[PDB]
């Protein structure tokens, strides 16, 4: 079968800059499509016919290449342009996988915050130690739990948002689910965010016998 | 102009059947070739099934395996997609997509109808209030949380205040645990404001016919 192979998977840069992002195919091929997708929307056509711009699509960006590879390129780029690009052509199957462009811009440490499980969700048996880490980047971030001293691993969930659409930060939620009986064995919870905006840990903690 | 507007999607359990429809609007829809394709949740998008113009041409993706069926009415301006003896790997979101020329780029596509193909029931979600309690903080800011635990299928839409409080809110993508979806959502506002001001998270699931409203009232301690 004909498969295609896109690279970077994902990638990230300033607006100004030059982006450049490839598309292979297993065997020779020609006329390929590239199709934008921002989070919550459809598909939409892009480039078509290797080199042909959809309408509403600015002369910034470009197609090109010919039988195994072929790539789709922006000049200067604007916010405007992140989303995942895929390609497609007309003998395949599976589109390839895509490439996500993401916006830079300056590191932002995380407003970190930290719930105890609610009453509510108590009375009900389980026990969600909720953490938010707010408005940081780059996206990498560590957090770190840790209950009466020693960190623990089990049982924390950890979600990103998307990058934000006004700011271009992420925010991520890391919440920890314990058994009422396990939360209830234990006294001081922390969250501790690990970021590259400094060497030192944001720390937010709690005792579960204190309120 | 012109519109595709797909429907019938759902939940389904595994070894089930289900029948997709696109209504096209806005074109000559018996002139253009028609295709499904499906955004797999890894967001992979595979060629389901294409129809030609007059419906007499059709081809289908490599995994599909006779147990789809793509036919369209151009009187009534609708493609369909019959589906049969579903499996968990094709839960995805279904697009229907026109054609343009011949090199089959794909120029218009739908909204795009959702299939989960699961033996899960459709269960209402919890949702727990998140004051700071024990962790109280003292900034010009304060960020207060709902919690929303328990609930299939996707999605739940969340919203602060019914909306007033839209600035400062994070709603995280669900997660699957215990085979069922959790997420949270975290608004912030100014300190003096909470709680002389009252902040409510609205939380609503359709699939359930549920509507919930969670006060975030400061702990009694
Ligand atoms: C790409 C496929 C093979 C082939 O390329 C198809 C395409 C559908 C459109 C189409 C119509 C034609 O008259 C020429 C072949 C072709 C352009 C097909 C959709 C599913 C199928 C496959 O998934 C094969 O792996």
């Known amino acids: 079968d004909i498969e295609l192979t896109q690279s970077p998977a994902v990638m990230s840069a300033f607006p100004g800059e030059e982006v450049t992002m490839t598309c292979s195919a297993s065997?020779?091929?020609?006329?390929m499509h590239w199709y934008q997708q921002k989070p919550g929307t459809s598909p939409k056509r892009w480039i078509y016919d290797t080199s042909k711009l959809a309408s509403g699509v600015p002369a910034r960006f470009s197609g090109s290449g010919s039988g195994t590879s072929y790539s789709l390129t922006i000049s200067s780029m604007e916010a405007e342009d992140a989303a995942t690009y895929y390609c497609?052509?007309?003998?395949?199957?599976?589109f390839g996988s895509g490439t996500k462009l993401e916006i830079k811009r300056a590191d932002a440490a995380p407003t970190v915050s930290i719930f105890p499980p609610s009453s509510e969700q108590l009375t009900s048996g389980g026990a969600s130690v909720v953490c938010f880490l707010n408005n940081f980047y780059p996206k990498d971030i560590n957090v770190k739990w840790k209950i009466d001293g020693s960190e623990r691993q089990n049982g924390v969930l950890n979600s990103w948002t998307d990058q934000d659409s006004k700011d271009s930060t992420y925010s991520m939620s890391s919440t920890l689910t314990l058994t009422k009986d396990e939360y209830e064995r234990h006294n001081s919870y922390t969250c501790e965010a690990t970021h590259k905006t400094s060497t030192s840990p944001i720390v937010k903690s709690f005792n579960r016998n204190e309120c | 102009e012109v519109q595709l507007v797909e429907s019938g999607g759902g939940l389904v359990k595994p070894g089930g059947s289900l029948k997709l429809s696109c209504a096209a609007s806005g074109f000559a829809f018996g002139n253009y070739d028609m295709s499904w394709v499906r955004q797999t949740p890894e967001k992979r998008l595979e060629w389901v099934a294409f129809?030609?113009?007059?419906?007499?041409?059709?081809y289908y993706g490599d995994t599909m395996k006779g147990r789809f069926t793509i036919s369209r009415d151009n009187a009534k301006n609708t493609l369909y997609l019959q589906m049969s003896s579903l499996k968990s790997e094709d839960t995805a979101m279904y697009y229907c997509?026109?054609?343009?020329?011949?090199?089959?780029?794909?120029?218009?596509w739908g909204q795009g109808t959702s299939v989960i193909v699961s033996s899960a029931k459709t269960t209402p979600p919890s949702v727990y209030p998140l004051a700071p309690g024990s962790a109280a903080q003292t900034n010009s800011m304060v960020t207060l949380g709902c919690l929303v635990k328990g609930y299939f299928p996707e999605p739940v839409t969340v919203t602060w205040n019914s909306g007033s409080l839209s600035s400062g809110v994070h709603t995280f993508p669900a997660v699957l645990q215990s085979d069922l979806y959790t997420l949270s959502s975290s608004v912030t506002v100014p300190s003096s404001t909470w709680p002389s001001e009252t902040v409510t998270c609205n939380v609503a699931h359709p699939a359930s016919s549920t509507k919930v409203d969670k006060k975030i009232v400061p702990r009694d301690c």
């Open positions: 129809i030609g113009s007059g419906g007499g041409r059709i």
């Open positions: 997509t026109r054609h343009y020329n011949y090199y089959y780029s794909m120029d218009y």
């Open positions: 497609h052509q007309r003998s395949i199957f599976t």
């Open positions: 065997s020779s091929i020609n006329y």
